[PDB]
């Protein structure tokens, strides 16, 4: 029972928890026999016999487990569950089998969301009730301020605390450094077989990606708008992989703009032409009883391909470097002043914060700001993060549009340095806005069972969502419309609470919702204008408290109706207060009965929320929170 | 060298094996490669010099799943059901027990031509029931020489054709690992598809206790798993566990030393020749995940399917006797001797090692040469609207005696596993849509549901759905007709009270049952109820009412039914066997005549024999 095993479990949606977990395993390799596994890869049957367990997990959606964390969270939730309390009740709330085990939790999250680091807190809370002995109190990493930084602190303490408790680490010492990057470690070797895009992305992200097809794209806003929102039609080609129900999302895999990809490639020192199928092989120095066995292997992260296809379809080249990545960049800088700035930023303290949040630098902008960096083709290919797919609410009814998938996409573009800097185009939205019909569209369907229309047609539904948060409601109404016209049903009509900036500029799908109302689908259509010169600023929160307070109340309290909120997390949080008020001031219930009534609706799946994350007033919201919390 | 792309389609993995071997032969005179019709750009096709196609046919003449993309691509680039139900040559695996024999291979062969394609050799067929591996080896040599001269290489090593990718003794080793994945995750890695962990809620027999046979009702909980969303008509792919006794008998007969409780992995020696030796390293085989050998045999590997001729030859060089090593050699040549052996005894791997006890079996040969345990498909018997977060299955428990009922009992792998797993045990499975076996979008048209025994399975979701659209969505769909079939009304009438009830609620207009072993009345099949009781309701539906007819179950039955309806078209409406037969062709492409083939599930022994006798 020597060489204590340290099991590092992680859950992630974009790769941050996974990275930190790797870094954490590397550290524990010093005094312990450590392993880093995704929560889904791990077999819950070993847990009770685990000596030490370290959890690094983010939280997603509406205070939920990352998708690859759901199974593990249910499992715990199960072993621990005499009856009561739901996950949504205790951990995302409105205001022993593991005796042998020692653990500690680090959770990633954002103060921009209601239930900050919810999944980390549930796991942390749950391992303790199951009989586990917590080493360090749970620490939280805020994506808005010092996330990578707070990881180090905790990583340091927890290691020290583990060494102390297990009484090992009298030979491990006070301390880049690991599988980071080193020139005699990674090598790009030639290959003659380059997979197909959708097949390569399936390997890379361990899931089946189907090739969809672009049929058309149209502007949903006036040509006189400064903004742009596009209606996109895709042909699924029969593929049963792409079956969906109204409410579900489509995950899409973009391509970085070629110019940016090229600028980047033309800045590498030693790099084959940006065209030669090259696999990446790494010098892996294993270790045996004989001594140390060293040899070449396949990194096996990216599939065989040209560096161009790699930077274009598989690697994140626009997300600002983490402090770690800057550290590897620094040791490549050949200019005194130019290299110290790199080391100052490597800290993740304020300078980093200001630089990142101020310049929102792409990989290219960084190499160009510190032109004395000798960038190795293999450092990027192995250190950059994978290009993540972006999710989009499906905007079509599969009955009204068989073998078709529609999307409503806000075109993200903004100026850096608070309007002074150049333009940065969102990766997926700008891609979806320029692909041609011959272009393949890598995607998959991710069902959203908490956001499907009710099984019972005769109950009232209130659909709340500003801007593109209307996207899924378009599948709701098209679907209800088809039901009426062809299935011979008379479902209780619904109410739509939309919200935008200007009557004849932003009200997307206006006529389309009109036509749907005349057909019985909707009882009434409410709209909140926020930048109308002719009146005051109104938000769906307002339309709800000023013109539906009664309907809302009668719908939810007597008619057994449902309310659906979709879009920006700030709005959704506001809509939850507007409803808590309407419930209080329209039924005489304190912040108690109103809160518990809501908390009940959710419980019974009658209060639905589909969070897009932070999409509205991004600058002002991120700015307020960033500051206010440091 | 010329580049030869060998494209293969496969479900149970036989065509895959054939292509990899085909690749090892074409290596001699060509630059040959092998991959799925999915792991390939259909755009590169036209820029190919030589394309070899090895593909099986599934469904009812349908392309295997991984051969769906490719199929329609050649179709548009150049309906399917109608017609079939660069240099290149096709070899299609199949079975003469199915109507549209090698339908996919014959379709791909036809369409390649219609795309600037020149055929080398006449497309061959490989009947799973008689001389499959035999016709392949042949066509294999005949097409090699054929392309060899077509592309003009002269006198080269045309005698080399037991090859290289075949197990040797220091090309493989089992290195310990202290971290083995969870089963469902391991399976997702092995089969490259998302497999979810579902849990058993309950199982109950739907046949009378006084029955000799047995069918079970199975309820699984999806656990809110979005990956497990389905529609009535869809199938659930399930991964079972082999029985422990057979797993431990197999381990205890093993030569290699791996304790069974230790996690291991299979590394293979990757060597790259040089001018004075070789530059090499041990890479992970990476077919199976790290797991205990007990777990590989119980959950990842097929230890019951009879050894192929290729796997026997290998056992040959491992027998320490002479008769044994010789019988092995005889059987290694998939001919009369081997076919009689296999079909007659249908030996598990364990029985093979016991019929030939001098074989010294190393663990790394089984772990690398045995086929992957394939998942079994089951028609979902529940409506998702009626049973949220639930998946129900109707499962016939397969169990037969070898050597024509004279030998030991052999249990169906998945059916028997599903028949003994305990509540809450994990059930790895996934959902595979059947877009061609879904209820019509128009619920105001009549549907005629035909299917005996377990063939009823998808209809229980059809009628639970309709019952739900009625009792809850407030719609009034055109009532349906159920044409069922079983052995004895008092024994085999599974879900009798349920279909009965579905009638009382307006789901079903009428319920027609056919019995085949009622010791009173004659042996009536469902094809006999169509003609002898509804020949008119069927004609009016498929001709005037814009109706739909769904056929589900054994391929033989489904065929007797097609040939029946085609006549009900002649007789009742007056059109010839080419005017009614092609009208059903228009039905199957208009998607109003639905078929869902389970394979050969009925009268297996009787049927598959006459068929061996058919071709032989
Ligand atoms: C379940 C779900 C459903 C969704 N459905 C939809 C949908 O239906 N329709 C839709 O349009 N979107 C939807 N989204 C949002 C969407 O997926 C993408 O986040 C969005 O299109 C932007 O992606 P991008 O790839 O274009 O830009 P990305 O390049 O990734 O860039 C966005 C990042 O830009 C920064 N950026 C943006 N604005 C500014 C600014 N003003 N100032 C400084 N920096 C800024 C932020 O740091 C932000 O994270 C959904 C998200 C989720 C999780
Ligand atoms: C789309 C689809 C849907 C299906 N739906 C269902 C369903 O809903 N319900 C259901 O019960 N089944 C269904 N099946 C059949 C099912 O999937 C399995 O084939 C079946 O349960 C048996 O699997 P097993 O794994 O138990 O036996 P397996 O071990 O694979 O064994 C069967 C093999 O045994 C031989 N064997 C069987 N009987 C005999 C005999 N009498 N004499 C000599 N040799 C014999 C055959 O060679 C056969 O291949 C479906 C198949 C498909 C393709
Ligand atoms: N700044 C840029 O150049 C730029 C460019 C591309 C995309 N983007 C971003 O990408 C997003 C996509 O646009 P979109 O179509 O979804 O919507 P949008 O036009 O940004 O706004 C949606 C509507 O909801 C309102 N709203 C804002 N905050 C709210 C809150 N906290 N609670 C309730 N309602 C609220 C808005 O009011 P307001 O009048 O207050 O906005 C607006 O009327 C944009 O909203 C924007 O943040 C910005
Ligand atoms: N051979 C065995 O002893 C044995 C035992 C247990 C399970 N099994 C297998 O497991 C399967 C599951 O049983 P099941 O519930 O699906 O059904 P089943 O009991 O095998 O029979 C389904 C019904 O369909 C009839 N039928 C048979 N062949 C037909 C054809 N060619 N065309 C139209 N109708 C036909 C049968 O009549 P008949 O009376 O003419 O068969 C029977 O009444 C079995 O059918 C069988 O394959 C076999
Ligand atoms: C749609 C979306 C929903 C999110 N929901 C929450 C949330 O409820 N609580 C929280 O603390 N953070 C939330 N976040 C922030 C992530 O948890 C955080 O960005 C984290 O750094 C991502 O970590 P990962 O890369 O490991 O998955 C959310 C982010 C997105 C894009
Ligand atoms: C449900 C099912 C349906 C089948 N349908 C056909 C068919 O229409 N035509 C044919 O020639 N073979 C058919 N077969 C036989 C396969 O083509 C044959 O068993 C082949 O050996 C499987 O090869 P594979 O393992 O490479 O996919 C079918 C087999 C099953 C299990
Ligand atoms: O300051 S740099 O971006 O020129
Ligand atoms: O094989 S069953 O007992 O898990």
């Amino acid at each position: 029972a020597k060489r204590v095993k340290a099991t590092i479990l992680y859950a992630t949606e974009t790769g941050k928890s996974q990275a930190y977990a790797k870094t954490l395993c590397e550290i524990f390799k010093h005094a312990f026999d450590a392993k880093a596994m995704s929560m889904e890869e791990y077999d819950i049957v070993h847990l009770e016999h685990e000596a030490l367990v370290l959890v690094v997990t983010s939280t997603f959606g509406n205070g939920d487990p990352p998708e690859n964390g759901e199974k593990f969270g249910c499992a715990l939730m199960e072993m621990r569950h005499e009856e009561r309390k739901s996950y949504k009740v205790r951990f995302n709330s409105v205001s022993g089998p593991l005796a042998n085990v020692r653990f500690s939790v680090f959770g990633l999250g954002s103060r921009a969301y209601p239930h900050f680091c919810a999944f980390g807190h549930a796991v942390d809370t749950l391992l303790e009730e199951l009989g586990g002995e917590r080493i360090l109190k749970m620490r939280e990493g805020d994506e808005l301020c010092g996330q990578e930084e707070a990881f180090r602190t905790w990583a340091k303490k927890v290691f020290k605390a583990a060494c102390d408790v297990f009484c090992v680490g009298d030979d491990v010492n006070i301390e880049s450094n690991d599988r980071s990057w080193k020139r005699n470690k990674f090598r790009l070797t030639y290959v003659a077989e380059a997979p197909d895009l959708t097949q390569g992305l399936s390997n890379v992200h361990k899931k089946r990606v189907s090739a969809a097809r672009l049929l058309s794209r149209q502007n949903l806003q006036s040509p006189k708008s400064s903004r742009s929102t596009i209606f996109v039609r895709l042909h699924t080609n029969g593929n049963q992989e792409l079956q969906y129900q109204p409410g579900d999302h489509l995950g899409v895999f973009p391509g970085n703009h070629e110019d940016l990809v090229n600028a980047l490639i033309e800045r590498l020192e030693d790099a084959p032409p940006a065209n030669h199928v090259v696999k990446v092989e790494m010098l892996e120095e294993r270790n045996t009883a004989l001594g140390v066995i060293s040899n070449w292997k396949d990194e096996s992260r990216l599939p065989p391909c040209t560096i161009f296809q790699a930077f274009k379809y598989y690697l994140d080249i626009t997300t600002p470097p983490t402090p770690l990545q800057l550290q590897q960049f620094a040791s490549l800088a050949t200019n005194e002043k130019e290299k110290q700035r790199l080391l100052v930023l490597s800290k993740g303290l304020q300078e980093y914060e200001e630089w990142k949040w101020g310049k929102n630098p792409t990989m290219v902008e960084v190499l160009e700001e510190f032109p004395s960096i000798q960038m190795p083709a293999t450092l990027l290919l192995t250190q950059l993060s994978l290009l993540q797919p972006r999710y989009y609410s499906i905007s079509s009814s599969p009955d009204m549009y068989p073998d078709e998938v529609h999307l409503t996409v806000a075109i993200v573009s903004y100026h850096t340095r608070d309007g002074e800097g150049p333009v940065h185009h969102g990766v997926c939205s700008s891609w979806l806005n320029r692909i041609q019909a011959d272009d393949v569209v890598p995607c998959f369907v991710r069902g959203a069972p908490s956001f499907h229309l009710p099984r019972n047609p005769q109950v009232p539904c209130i659909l709340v969502g500003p801007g593109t948060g209307i996207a899924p409601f378009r599948s709701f109404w098209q679907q209800r419309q088809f039901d009426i016209q062809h299935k011979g049903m008379n479902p209780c009509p619904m109410v739509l609470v939309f919200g935008c900036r200007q009557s004849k500029i932003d009200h997307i799908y206006r006529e389309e919702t009109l036509q749907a109302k005349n057909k019985g689908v909707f009882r009434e259509l409410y709209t909140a204008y926020s930048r109308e010169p002719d009146r005051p600023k109104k938000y769906v929160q307002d339309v709800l408290q000023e013109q539906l307070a009664e309907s809302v109340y009668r719908a939810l309290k007597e008619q057994g109706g449902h309310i659906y909120v979709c879009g920006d997390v700030t709005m959704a949080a506001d809509v939850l207060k507007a409803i808590q008020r309407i419930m209080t001031q329209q039924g005489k219930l304190s912040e108690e009965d109103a809160g518990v009534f809501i908390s009940r609706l959710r419980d019974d799946n009658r209060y639905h929320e589909d969070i897009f994350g932070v999409t509205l007033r991004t600058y002002e919201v991120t700015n307020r929170l960033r500051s206010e919390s440091i």
Side-chain angles (χ1 to χ4, degrees), chain A residues 322-493:
Chain A
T322 48
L324 184 49
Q325 301 189 321
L326 283 178
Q327 188 68 176
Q328 304 186 64
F329 278 179
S331 70
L332 301 181
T334 62
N335 176 300
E336 176 174 47
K337 179 185 179 183
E338 196 167 309
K339 174 182 176 132
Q340 296 170 75
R341 178 57 177 181
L342 263 155
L343 292 167
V344 176
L345 301 170
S346 279
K347 308 157 187 185
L349 300 183
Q350 292 164 20
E351 323 82 343
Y352 177 65
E353 297 303 338
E354 166 181 354
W355 175 75
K356 170 182 172 185
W357 290 131
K359 303 186 182 192
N360 174 52
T362 59
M363 222 43 91
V364 171
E365 289 177 314
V366 175
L367 298 173
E368 300 190 324
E369 179 182 2
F370 307 100
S372 67
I373 289 189
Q374 61 212 53
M375 197 54 246
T378 99
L379 172 42
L380 297 182
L381 292 170
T382 165
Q383 302 311 289
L384 288 179
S385 292
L386 298 172
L387 193 46
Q388 299 293 306
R390 274 64 158 159
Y391 292 95
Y392 291 99
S393 292
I394 286 150
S395 300
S396 61
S397 162
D399 279 335
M400 180 172 304
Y401 291 93
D403 301 31
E404 247 186 292
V405 168
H406 300 171
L407 305 169
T408 308
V409 182
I411 302 302
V412 167
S413 95
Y414 52 95
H415 283 91
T416 58
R417 315 174 200 236
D418 192 339
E420 294 302 304
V423 187
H424 279 195
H425 294 292
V427 174
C428 204
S429 59
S430 72
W431 180 67
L432 284 170
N433 188 43
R434 63 171 194 271
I435 37 180
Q436 296 277 273
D438 68 317
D439 284 303
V440 170
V441 163
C443 63
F444 64 99
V445 172
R446 185 181 181 175
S450 52
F451 215 76
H452 282 168
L453 280 168
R455 272 145 74 220
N456 177 181
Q458 330 308 161
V459 106
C461 291
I462 302 174
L463 319 186
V464 182
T468 54
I470 197 186
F473 300 144
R474 183 166 184 280
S475 65
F476 280 22
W477 81 58
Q478 280 187 346
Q479 183 70 208
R480 278 304 174 70
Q481 180 172 279
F482 185 100
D483 288 7
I484 280 172
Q485 296 176 13
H486 306 289
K487 296 201 184 185
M489 27 190 286
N490 301 96
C492 179

Side-chain angles (χ1 to χ4, degrees), chain A residues 525-562:
Chain A
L525 311 178
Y526 304 74
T527 306
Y529 298 100
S530 58
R531 303 188 189 194
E532 199 67 4
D534 330 53
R535 15 180 181 169
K537 168 177 289 185
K538 288 298 193 172
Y539 282 171
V540 296
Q541 294 89 122
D542 304 312
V543 172
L544 271 175
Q545 298 184 353
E546 289 169 41
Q547 306 178 356
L548 297 177
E550 187 252 88
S551 288
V552 171
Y553 185 78
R554 205 199 172 182
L556 309 182
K557 195 63 186 177
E558 293 171 326
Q559 314 176 169
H562 295 211

